Amino acid sequence: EELFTGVVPILIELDGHVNGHCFFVRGEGEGDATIGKLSLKFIATTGKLPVPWPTLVTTLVQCFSRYPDHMKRHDFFKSAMPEGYVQERTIYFKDDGTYKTRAEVKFEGDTLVNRIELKGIDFKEDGNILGHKLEYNFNSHKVYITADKQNNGIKANFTIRHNVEDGSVQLADHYQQNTPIDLPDDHYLSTQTILSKDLNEKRDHMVLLEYVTAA
Ligand SMILES: [Cu+2]
């Protein structure tokens, strides 16, 4: 709780391998967990990414979600601090390839840091992902959390809707395990996101603003 009153600096570092391709992504910014606001800039320090930016958005700190006082007792992510929880995920793109990921989220000094390993496999050649055919926007989604207990963590479930350029939609099935390095009765996070760019950046990048509240 108290480690998130005020505004906290965020550092996100990603390690990506998809179909033999390679990338590293670094993001700075800050979060305000008392109103659920995130602001972040990400740079692909290894030139043009091999996947479209919005596939990585879900993957790149839920501990910045806003919990109503009446729900403060059900916030897992904050309870596991300043020590760090591990976020594990599996992501199926329908009829297109998979992401499997592991991440440690923890405080380092006064910075909340999130360090991430990613593998991406079986992704179709010139499918929507490897073919960069998704629109550069993000939609709203609900993230259904539930207790794990038998491994002192939480699980999660949601489906991301991706806008394809022609007008169809790429579905991305997420499964999630978090585990500490507290338990919540079944609720969900309501997520809202805006993908932008910075007209004074040359490098390849993404600006991201986002609001999340629990219900
Ligand atoms: Cu690597």
Side-chain angles (χ1 to χ4, degrees):
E1 199 193 8
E2 302 77 7
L3 315 99
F4 298 87
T5 60
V7 176
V8 184
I10 292 157
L11 194 64
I12 292 161
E13 310 192 306
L14 180 58
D15 204 23
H17 297 260
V18 190
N19 277 43
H21 281 170
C22 199
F23 53 97
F24 180 93
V25 172
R26 181 177 181 170
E28 293 143 354
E30 68 271 56
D32 193 342
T34 61
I35 80 162
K37 184 185 193 301
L38 289 186
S39 179
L40 311 165
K41 187 177 177 186
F42 300 95
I43 308 87
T45 50
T46 56
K48 184 180 68 65
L49 293 176
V51 302
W53 271 104
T55 59
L56 295 186
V57 168
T58 189
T59 300
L60 295 160
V61 279
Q62 270 137 60
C63 68
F64 274 94
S65 301
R66 187 177 157 275
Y67 279 76
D69 199 31
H70 84 270
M71 260 190 251
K72 284 288 199 60
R73 47 180 211 267
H74 297 272
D75 184 348
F76 166 79
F77 318 88
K78 283 203 184 71
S79 77
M81 297 290 179
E83 312 100 43
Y85 62 85
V86 167
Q87 203 172 96
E88 305 172 301
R89 274 226 271 259
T90 305
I91 303 180
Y92 305 101
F93 297 82
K94 308 266 212 157
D95 308 274
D96 255 20
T98 293
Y99 286 166
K100 295 167 181 171
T101 55
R102 181 211 180 83
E104 303 154 323
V105 179
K106 71 178 78 194
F107 264 91
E108 302 194 353
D110 71 357
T111 291
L112 186 130
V113 192
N114 177 25
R115 285 193 188 87
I116 314 143
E117 282 143 316
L118 188 147
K119 279 194 179 84
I121 61 171
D122 290 345
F123 266 91
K124 288 212 182 46
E125 296 79 44
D126 207 86
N128 278 320
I129 309 301
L130 278 177
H132 295 62
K133 312 283 181 192
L134 308 193
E135 272 303 282
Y136 187 68
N137 45 51
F138 216 58
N139 288 341
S140 317
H141 308 88
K142 295 190 209 153
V143 173
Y144 303 85
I145 307 194
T146 180
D148 206 310
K149 291 205 182 184
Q150 296 292 340
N151 48 86
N152 202 32
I154 71 181
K155 285 185 164 181
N157 296 298
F158 53 99
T159 293
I160 296 303
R161 317 153 179 260
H162 288 291
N163 289 284
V164 177
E165 54 183 337
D166 61 38
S168 79
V169 154
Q170 179 69 52
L171 289 185
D173 295 319
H174 292 57
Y175 300 90
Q176 179 175 353
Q177 295 85 0
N178 293 38
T179 59
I181 296 187
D182 196 316
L183 306 193
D185 275 320
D186 290 345
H187 67 290
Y188 66 95
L189 295 174
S190 177
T191 75
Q192 298 195 90
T193 300
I194 297 168
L195 266 36
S196 194
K197 293 221 170 296
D198 173 23
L199 308 181
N200 323 284
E201 182 76 73
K202 285 136 216 51
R203 294 167 284 176
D204 194 346
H205 74 272
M206 168 182 70
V207 186
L208 186 154
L209 176 69
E210 170 176 325
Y211 285 65
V212 172
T213 314

